[PDB]
Ligand binder design. Sequence first.
Ligand SMILES: OC[C@H]1O[C@@H](O)[C@H](O)[C@@H](O)[C@@H]1O
Ligand SMILES: OC[C@H]1O[C@@H](O)[C@H](O)[C@@H](O)[C@@H]1O
Ligand code: NA
Lengths: 346, 339
Amino acid sequence: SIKIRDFGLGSDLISLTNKAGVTISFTNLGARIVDWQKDGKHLILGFDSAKEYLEKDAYPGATVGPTAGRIKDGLVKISGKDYILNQNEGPQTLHGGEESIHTKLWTYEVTDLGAEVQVKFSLVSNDGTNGYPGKIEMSVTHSFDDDNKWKIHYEAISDKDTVFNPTGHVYFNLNGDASESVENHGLRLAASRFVPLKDQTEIVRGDIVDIKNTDLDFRQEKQLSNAFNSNMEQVQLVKGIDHPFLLDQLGLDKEQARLTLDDTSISVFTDQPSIVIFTANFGDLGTLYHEKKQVHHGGITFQCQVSPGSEQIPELGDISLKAGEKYQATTIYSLHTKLEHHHHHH
Amino acid sequence: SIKIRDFGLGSDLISLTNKAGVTISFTNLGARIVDWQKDGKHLILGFDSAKEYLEKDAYPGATVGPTAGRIKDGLVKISGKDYILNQNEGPQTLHGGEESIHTKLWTYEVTDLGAEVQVKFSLVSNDGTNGYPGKIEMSVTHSFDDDNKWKIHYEAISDKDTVFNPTGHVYFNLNGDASESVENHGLRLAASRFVPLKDQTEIVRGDIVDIKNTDLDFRQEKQLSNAFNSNMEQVQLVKGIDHPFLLDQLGLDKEQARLTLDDTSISVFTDQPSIVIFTANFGDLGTLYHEKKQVHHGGITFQCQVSPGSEQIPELGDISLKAGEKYQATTIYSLHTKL
Ligand SMILES: OC[C@H]1O[C@@H](O)[C@H](O)[C@@H](O)[C@@H]1O
Ligand SMILES: OC[C@H]1O[C@@H](O)[C@H](O)[C@@H](O)[C@@H]1O
Ligand code: NA
């Protein structure tokens, strides 16, 4: 079933319940996921109204872009030309600049396919918005089906050569409580390399490093605590994880990551080459989620996209988008129960 | 009473009914007025869903900007520098360029003051959007009261020197039906001059013209048909009226214009210096409003703002907005019924 109601400030909340009783909800403010529950338990982080997002943290569950991540000095090269984008983090352009797409009300239409329900959000980024050549006609379709798969499908076409590499900013916390650290979760991730950051500004260092057999190696499932407790330079730098991991094998058909807690698992599939993992390294900020003070490490993202830093590390990819060319990207998060045995204590 | 409902594509329809039983409705799609009715008759033109506006005509009732009207060649100069804005009508920038603020979903908040209810719409125009320096934080407040006064109050702040001169694009039609020409309405307007158009491109011609004692003199109430049947080259040029009229006396307290049909009249007040009057000169287009095919001359606007063409005729004013300055504008449409 599908339900809709005002979510505040003119945004709406679209709630779907599939045949298995699982419910998931989205808002057109930032074409974002607001909640995902199983048996009354929140699987992700979210707020209860639109205003909270605007006042507390606008990123959670949002669609971010046009370019996700940081671009050093806000400088990109588009068809031999240098362009400077809005700089909202020091000289850096983070997540598309200020008052970006995650802060706008997108229009939308719901399509009921029975076993699947699609919520297609649309927005036009005008030419020159935040320094980006356009216009860019974007759409993000969020769908949920009877198989417990939440899929995000992105599409875009620009009138001019530009750059495009958006992502989905959901945070998971299988504890269903922000005040509980995700160090108790098990993580499997099919990636043998990562992109180190230069320093506190978080721009890329310039090299790609092999992480096999270090505390960041999750090719074989291990608890997140292993990473959090690590004193490896990079972990200490950011007080957790806040990095792009390069997938070893590409393709929508492969389970790239799996996050488990007891009997619940979330599997990640995508057609993108990297996954930026940020573990809510907010220290004592304590943003309130459902009246619970969020803890350091109280959430984890799996932002699938082309890795940030390609400006400096060309091997990472090319995010350019040619005029008239159709962009597409697909990321899927699937929920499972008793996929494996995970019985630990922390 | 206030009622909020889905208006399509995620947009909302906010309807306010005052003590007199008059109903006015707005949508956050373009911070716009959708309907205004008394005793079951529509006083303005509007559609029944968001999709219609997008498919048929996105301008009716909307907040248009950042700059309302046409800018020759899309060119403006800011702090002595040339800037080219998005061109959406040939080389001109009309109503802020393509996919402008009238096509965006604005956020909003309703404030019930009892005798008056306000709906405050907000939107951020990012720096560089359609060529305009910013970011510009804008808000438009539409309010309605028990005295039948519909007021629009604009506010904006920019992080950078830029240009700003928005307007409200409601079309009135006291016949309550689009298939009926407004030629039968009487119009009074406190302006002795107007700004002629150069040609069919509708860019300003360059001069300011005195209209005293011509078919366009409405200082004394007159029926629109007069203007409409005029042989004035400017009338002939656009097939009706599509021009900026310069108000003789500035100030919000003065009734600047009045539109009448029978027992019903609309008074216009504004703190702006000009009113752009466009009489829906669409010929056979036949846009459908409420299933009624619109006729040529089936509507009239009162776009209060600084006259378009200031790029070429500086006497008209200056639409620059310096960084950090707060822009304000107010326009009121007051409804009256003779007893
Ligand atoms: O929400 C703010 C956070 O956004 C994440 O996507 C970035 O990776 C973090 O470095 C940043 O602190
Ligand atoms: O909606 C399009 C119309 O907008 C009006 O404000 C302009 O004055 C007309 O020239 C134009 O045809
Ligand atoms: Na809505």
